[PDB]
Amino acid sequence: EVAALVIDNGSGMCKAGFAGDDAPRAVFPSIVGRPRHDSYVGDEAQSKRGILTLRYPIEHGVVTNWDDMEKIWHHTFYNELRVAPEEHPVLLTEAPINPKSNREKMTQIVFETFNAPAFYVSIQAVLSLYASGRTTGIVLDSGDGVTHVVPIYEGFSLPHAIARLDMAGRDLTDYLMKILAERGYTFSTTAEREIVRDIKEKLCYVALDFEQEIQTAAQSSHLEKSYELPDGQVITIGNERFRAPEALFQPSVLGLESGGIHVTTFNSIMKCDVDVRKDLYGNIVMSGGTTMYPGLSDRMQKEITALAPSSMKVKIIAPPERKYSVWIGGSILASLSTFQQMWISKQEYDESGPSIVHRKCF
Amino acid sequence: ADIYGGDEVSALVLDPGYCNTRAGFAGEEMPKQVIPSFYGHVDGRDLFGDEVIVPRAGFEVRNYMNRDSMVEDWDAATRVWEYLLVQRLQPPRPTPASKNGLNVKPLTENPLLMTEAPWNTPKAREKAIEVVMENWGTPAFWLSRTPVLAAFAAGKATALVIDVGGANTSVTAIHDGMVLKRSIQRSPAAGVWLSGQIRSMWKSQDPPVNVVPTFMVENKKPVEAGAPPDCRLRNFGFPIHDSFRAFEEERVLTEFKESVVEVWRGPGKYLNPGNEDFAKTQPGRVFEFPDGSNQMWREQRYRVAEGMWDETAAYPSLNPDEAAITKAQTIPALIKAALDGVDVDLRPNLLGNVVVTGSTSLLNGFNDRLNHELTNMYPGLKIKLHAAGLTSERRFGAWIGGSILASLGTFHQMWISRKEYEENGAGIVEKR
Amino acid sequence: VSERVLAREGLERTDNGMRQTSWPEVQPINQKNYYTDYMKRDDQILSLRLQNEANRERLVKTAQMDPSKIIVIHPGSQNLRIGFASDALPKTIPMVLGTQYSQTESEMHEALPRRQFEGRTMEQQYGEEWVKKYQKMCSDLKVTMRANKLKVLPNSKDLVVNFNRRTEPEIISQHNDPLQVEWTNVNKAPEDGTTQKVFIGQQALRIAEDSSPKYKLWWPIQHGWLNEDDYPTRAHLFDDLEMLLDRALRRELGLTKKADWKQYSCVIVIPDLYDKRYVELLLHLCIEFFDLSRVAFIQESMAATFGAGYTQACVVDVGAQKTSISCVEDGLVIEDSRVNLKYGGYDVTETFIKMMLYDNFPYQDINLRRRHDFLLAEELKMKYCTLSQANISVQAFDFHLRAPNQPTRKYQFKFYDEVILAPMGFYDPSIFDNSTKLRGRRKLIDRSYNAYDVDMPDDPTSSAQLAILAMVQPSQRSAKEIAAERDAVLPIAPLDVAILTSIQHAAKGDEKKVRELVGSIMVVGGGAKIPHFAPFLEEKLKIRRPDLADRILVSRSAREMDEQVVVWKGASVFAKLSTNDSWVTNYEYKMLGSRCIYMKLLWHY
Amino acid sequence: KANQGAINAGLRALDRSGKPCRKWTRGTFQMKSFTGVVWEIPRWTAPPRPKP
Amino acid sequence: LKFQSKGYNQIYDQIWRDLARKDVSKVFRLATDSYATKASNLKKTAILASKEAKRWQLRTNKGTKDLQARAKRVMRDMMGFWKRNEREERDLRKAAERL
DNA sequence: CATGTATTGAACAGCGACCTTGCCGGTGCCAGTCGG
DNA sequence: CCGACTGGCACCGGCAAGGTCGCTGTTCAATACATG
Ligand SMILES: Nc1ncnc2c1ncn2[C@@H]1O[C@H](COP(=O)(O)OP(=O)(O)OP(=O)(O)O)[C@@H](O)[C@H]1O
Ligand SMILES: Nc1ncnc2c1ncn2[C@@H]1O[C@H](COP(=O)(O)OP(=O)(O)OP(=O)(O)O)[C@@H](O)[C@H]1O
Ligand SMILES: Nc1ncnc2c1ncn2[C@@H]1O[C@H](COP(=O)(O)OP(=O)(O)OP(=O)(O)O)[C@@H](O)[C@H]1O
Ligand SMILES: [Mg+2]
Ligand SMILES: [Mg+2]
Ligand SMILES: [Mg+2]
């Protein structure tokens, strides 16, 4: 008998696949394009940009344009997965502390637009913790659009202790354009920006000692790696390589007043009950695409060890799948026998309304 | 008939205090959003949340609440409550289309119930509903006192609430969910005063102890007890303001409060002849300041707290104008005065239903000592202490009470309607 | 009181048609006899699903892959082998990367072999322990070669020492110098499709000492592991192994246009006792940095038997700095058999120079961290070292020290027994400088913990290796602490003892498996190319286990190949053959990182 | 794994059959305080399911 | 004007007394029990989920046996490859450096 | 041409260990009946 | 609205029981290889 579906509603990239699978079937940009003067989604919308206004329907991890979001799910089911929701239960991920109204509205849409039989909404941080191997820990989830720190104890995510660094993978791309423009290259265009995001994904890393790297970058040849544009001209970038990710650790470097990921991790831990903190320092878990920079774990280990009491073991769990951990945890959850007595049935929706999600999903 | 779904009313419950402010939707076991009441100021620009306090040239740390646990800066109160109830708990408005890099009134849904300190004066209650009705378009409003909600967070209709806050320690008798007005008793001997005690005690050990806050250390290495710390401190392109340093040091005083200090729990006060001499021999508790400065703490661990139980024990204030605590402002004096403000016939019922509340009650041994003190000051009566809360986390007791109150279907008849306010102006006094 | 008076006043209590409460009521889950559908079928595991899709598509194309588009890489502390799977022999380059820097590698550290210059006596100058051990080994050889009834003139060492002391360099230039030899012109631009003036391989060694901009050489691999001793930071090390392999693709294979690389596939050979962090680094280079379509891993001894065509063998790999032993049977390296010793043909060179220096080798100023001295030392090692206890006598020879921008100096010299004692260090490894091999061994890159239980080490462990560690340091602590305590010991043992402790753990107590493996010894790796290494090792094994002396049989290389290339040739066969479904595809790795190595490899990773 | 009886109650009982769920809409509700004054809360509604 | 009435006082008090004694106590019990059950559900679920996430890595006899077979398949094929290059025809790529 | 074999890759059958919830004897706290 | 007394349900540790799962084992047609 046929499997349930798992959809990860990313600010940057949407991911979808069948429960039980260990990786998504479909990964495509969360872009909807409508004519300037039909609509297109994902790579098509980027390709046909010349005749389209493009908008993201998800901003800072949260859905903001429902009429567009419904088109992304339509593309997900009918073009990407090639399966009709009328025969499959669905698990949707959502960002931590998203508004109640958004839980209700996405409940409304996968019943009333897609006639899905039974469905469940799930906190992205928690799922990334399941995929990371454990029941208790603190999840730094850092995506394209937003960065959250979420303490979770005995599989319950503490809402009050969540801290949101409003800065993430797009900001680091805007920033890497900025510092390369200062170096001498031109990258103002959207068809240039989508090159710079690839440059960020390949060449960047996080320094273990930022001041020492700045001091030695003035003389080292090794640092200055080079990258071919589609245009055929070749760029070279140097201290830009680490100054782009370093903004995670020093958001002043790109001009906002929030504390870095390390201080926000520490503050989230410190907002927890004293008895729990031993376990959270022992179980820091990294999630989401922005956490993929080489050596982010080593620097998180260093920085939090500098903030923590010298008695605390500090442990940074960075699984190799951490780019898709949010989806993978969903896969797992939607493929336990237990799921059936945990979802919203259409028979419940039909007499409870969208507000059933506030009972049933917790 | 039977056209409606599974939902009643998505109320949200707001709970301001001197140290912290708490907000979120009714019918959840914890508030969604808890923030430092202390708010950032930089350059005519106000900043909120513990993620947005950091060293910057202009940075100054204000608070919209005074040490009476009442609002003193209603403009900032409006901005803070709008950050909680609007920016963090409602759907975002989408970006304009050009600005996304690809191309090249708010509370009408949710009634607001708000928490007030027991002694909060009518003028401040009037201004609360006035601010609410202008600024967010809210459909209905209600205002209720922390003791009443704290009792509901323990499940008790009638209770003695001991409420050991930050800026204030309070005792009050709750009966059938009303406060018995004569019983309200209040004291500075609370988590803020206790920080001053700890500061004083540090500035008076044989080598003086210097707190240095977490933000000023770049790197630290472990060191043996009482050694000079292997560390390197920061420097900045600007002076750090005194308000900022004071706020960032309070974290360390909170860490010392929670992980070291311990209420004297043995028989009799700490200053009875044998007790101090005994305490000096015991295994203590260890602590680390952010500097790396490591020490084992033996007998002071009790004394810093003991002053709120017997003023005789208290250290002198570091601020010379912060006058010493009177006998009448010690916890047993509060308790005895509070209960003596209540009908003699009701006293056993209250004492059987003791509710403890507030983060300062999370001192090790606080329930022990309070059980002893209640026993010895009211002999021949049963005593049973309860924490406010549904969980180990007894921090949120006032809030959780609101969450529960606004979820009771019987309650929704009580709200001050938008339409009542816009017809009467000061309903808030008499409809209570 | 009052009753209907309340209603007349307009005051009336009211439930508002609401429920008695709105607090969530939650039904408890039941998990009795629970089941899971997660990763239960090949359909669901991405690494297998993609392979089934590739199998189906191959069957369809058959009804109606290219060795020239498979690259085979085999890294090493002195040498990198690289080539296409089509190719008869791999191109070999010194795995060294040269860059502009403030100080050359000779200026940063004490000279090698290490000496206490201006020491109070020559016995202190070379270290007293070491001098006693050299004297032992000289006497041991004299007794041994007298037992074999060779000629020994009593004055042998004196004839060498006095001659080497009294002789002085001749000086030659122009057509009097046999070679008009070049130095790398670091000023000239790279024509191989790139901007940065960096050099690899033989050309990097041939950078003059006083080049106009100063160049420092770096080796990213030493002692058969990542060379964290030298590198300031992790990123700088990764960036150099990336830069070296990048230039090797460009400058040896001639794949100059980078955009074409996405259509190629790659086979990487890794040691039998690998660090997981080194395997996962090499994967990540091959996919995020080079964007190659497929990557596959084969273990050095596994590959060695694929180079021979052996079902079952004991493979002894004697590298420049690593010697490793493991026993192969039924398509796997036997997990517990693996032994990994931190010595090889470089130690023989250092030791060879140090023994001649102590005797009286003319160029006392020599320093193996200086490039032309390094090449000198290595050339002499390859010519004069021999484990054959024969044709050994006072012999006179000469070499040229073609220093950079300085006249060619020719030294006559003599040797007697340093030429055999230095190699024989493989049977008393204390004679080697092992003092700093363990230096910085976890300075940058931590030990490989398990993905989820991050205390627990997840590197390979082998009973045979622990037997070797116990011989150096006799051996409730956590598994982390135990692994740390083991890493603090440098694995060292005589080569015969290492082989027999390998084989005993391969057999797990079965004389018949012992009698097969001991009769099946195959020697590979360049250190093995010291003349008569295989027969000498057969002798040493015979005399430690007389119970096996009729079956013990050692063979050099396989099927006429050079010892160096066998493992490469084998890894090419694993590229070419059709049954191999071991490939990590590029799309797998993008989706699931190193997790897919566990799903795909042909052993328990 | 999947079978009959308990432990698969939901996976047997789910609808799978395309039929429309009842359409919800953001209606309103008249709420009456104990002081008799009436005020409006936004509340979900759907059309009545038919007679047996 | 509005709220000084004895009647108002009675209803206000009666609402609050019933709300405090009956409804707050019912809802307290229900909320505490509901929290305990929610926490239990999530604990139970997280324990299963976290086991599954790791389960693929645990060695099994069947997994071991099939892996040994995959190795042995490849090994026989490798012997076949050499048979097709030494027995089917002697097809060695003899080569020299020609320096 | 085409006799003859142990092993292969797999479907199918068998057994005990395992995790979890039901039913159980018992201690305890509680809502409700009754009198006032 | 209130307390004393009663029958009842919540909770404790404990043993009996369930199916899933992993370990164990027999049997089949098809295979590469050998003598013949
Ligand atoms: N290997 C990588 N190195 C660096 N950055 C990466 C890497 N892979 C992806 N990213 C970046 O991570 C972001 C995408 O991550 P992810 O898909 O988790 O975001 P998302 O979930 O859509 O965002 P959000 O969680 O905010 O909704 C992009 O900015 C992308 O460029
Ligand atoms: N674990 C702890 N142990 C003791 N004191 C603590 C602990 N955690 C926090 N505190 C202190 O108690 C106060 C926390 O705020 P709390 O809710 O208890 O009071 P508040 O409601 O913010 O202020 P108030 O009621 O006085 O207006 C602070 O003074 C804080 O330093
Ligand atoms: N012709 C030769 N004769 C003798 N010895 C040689 C010859 N050529 C090289 N060697 C020696 O053999 C050593 C081993 O070379 P090889 O290329 O196997 O190193 P390697 O495989 O990189 O070692 P490792 O893999 O452990 O780093 C060389 O370092 C050199 O000292
Ligand atoms: Mg995401
Ligand atoms: Mg308070
Ligand atoms: Mg080698």
PDB file of N, CA and C in Angstrom, chain B residues 271-289:
ATOM      1  N   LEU B 271      22.118  32.658  62.004  1.00  0.00           N
ATOM      2  CA  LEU B 271      22.941  33.349  62.986  1.00  0.00           C
ATOM      3  C   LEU B 271      22.763  32.798  64.410  1.00  0.00           C
ATOM      4  N   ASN B 272      21.923  31.773  64.622  1.00  0.00           N
ATOM      5  CA  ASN B 272      21.891  31.081  65.906  1.00  0.00           C
ATOM      6  C   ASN B 272      23.258  30.428  66.137  1.00  0.00           C
ATOM      7  N   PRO B 273      23.781  30.382  67.393  1.00  0.00           N
ATOM      8  CA  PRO B 273      25.229  30.303  67.619  1.00  0.00           C
ATOM      9  C   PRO B 273      26.010  29.203  66.892  1.00  0.00           C
ATOM     10  N   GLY B 274      25.452  27.984  66.799  1.00  0.00           N
ATOM     11  CA  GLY B 274      26.158  26.846  66.231  1.00  0.00           C
ATOM     12  C   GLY B 274      26.188  26.856  64.704  1.00  0.00           C
ATOM     13  N   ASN B 275      25.196  27.521  64.088  1.00  0.00           N
ATOM     14  CA  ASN B 275      24.838  27.290  62.694  1.00  0.00           C
ATOM     15  C   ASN B 275      25.941  27.788  61.757  1.00  0.00           C
ATOM     16  N   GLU B 276      26.438  29.016  61.950  1.00  0.00           N
ATOM     17  CA  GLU B 276      27.517  29.543  61.117  1.00  0.00           C
ATOM     18  C   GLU B 276      28.788  28.688  61.221  1.00  0.00           C
ATOM     19  N   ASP B 277      29.171  28.329  62.450  1.00  0.00           N
ATOM     20  CA  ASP B 277      30.374  27.546  62.697  1.00  0.00           C
ATOM     21  C   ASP B 277      30.268  26.169  62.042  1.00  0.00           C
ATOM     22  N   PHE B 278      29.058  25.584  62.024  1.00  0.00           N
ATOM     23  CA  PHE B 278      28.789  24.348  61.294  1.00  0.00           C
ATOM     24  C   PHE B 278      28.973  24.576  59.791  1.00  0.00           C
ATOM     25  N   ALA B 279      28.312  25.601  59.257  1.00  0.00           N
ATOM     26  CA  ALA B 279      28.324  25.857  57.828  1.00  0.00           C
ATOM     27  C   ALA B 279      29.749  26.016  57.282  1.00  0.00           C
ATOM     28  N   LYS B 280      30.629  26.722  57.997  1.00  0.00           N
ATOM     29  CA  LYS B 280      32.014  26.925  57.584  1.00  0.00           C
ATOM     30  C   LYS B 280      32.789  25.618  57.370  1.00  0.00           C
ATOM     31  N   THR B 281      32.335  24.492  57.951  1.00  0.00           N
ATOM     32  CA  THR B 281      33.031  23.209  57.823  1.00  0.00           C
ATOM     33  C   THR B 281      32.549  22.371  56.631  1.00  0.00           C
ATOM     34  N   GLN B 282      31.338  22.645  56.123  1.00  0.00           N
ATOM     35  CA  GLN B 282      30.678  21.787  55.150  1.00  0.00           C
ATOM     36  C   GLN B 282      31.342  21.867  53.772  1.00  0.00           C
ATOM     37  N   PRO B 283      31.147  20.834  52.914  1.00  0.00           N
ATOM     38  CA  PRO B 283      31.504  20.938  51.501  1.00  0.00           C
ATOM     39  C   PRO B 283      30.555  21.942  50.854  1.00  0.00           C
ATOM     40  N   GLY B 284      31.144  22.874  50.107  1.00  0.00           N
ATOM     41  CA  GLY B 284      30.416  23.995  49.530  1.00  0.00           C
ATOM     42  C   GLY B 284      29.846  23.717  48.145  1.00  0.00           C
ATOM     43  N   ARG B 285      29.792  24.760  47.299  1.00  0.00           N
ATOM     44  CA  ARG B 285      29.529  24.586  45.872  1.00  0.00           C
ATOM     45  C   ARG B 285      30.565  25.378  45.066  1.00  0.00           C
ATOM     46  N   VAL B 286      30.984  24.874  43.890  1.00  0.00           N
ATOM     47  CA  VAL B 286      31.932  25.622  43.062  1.00  0.00           C
ATOM     48  C   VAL B 286      31.210  26.582  42.110  1.00  0.00           C
ATOM     49  N   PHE B 287      31.955  27.576  41.588  1.00  0.00           N
ATOM     50  CA  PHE B 287      31.443  28.517  40.596  1.00  0.00           C
ATOM     51  C   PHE B 287      32.541  29.068  39.687  1.00  0.00           C
ATOM     52  N   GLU B 288      32.155  29.455  38.473  1.00  0.00           N
ATOM     53  CA  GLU B 288      33.084  30.132  37.584  1.00  0.00           C
ATOM     54  C   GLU B 288      32.461  31.411  37.056  1.00  0.00           C
ATOM     55  N   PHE B 289      33.168  32.522  37.244  1.00  0.00           N
ATOM     56  CA  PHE B 289      32.888  33.733  36.505  1.00  0.00           C
ATOM     57  C   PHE B 289      33.353  33.556  35.055  1.00  0.00           C
TER      58      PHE B 289
END
